[PDB]
Amino acid sequence: EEECVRLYIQWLKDGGPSSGRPPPC
Numbered sequence: 001e002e003e004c005v006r007l008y009i010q011w012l013k014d015g016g017p018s019s020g021r022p023p024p025c
Helices: 003-014
Strands: none
Touching: none
């Protein structure tokens, strides 16, 4: 996948902009 289509989305699972990181996407 991609920074977005993996990392971010994974990040998005973490909570996205509530996850703690800024969106990879």
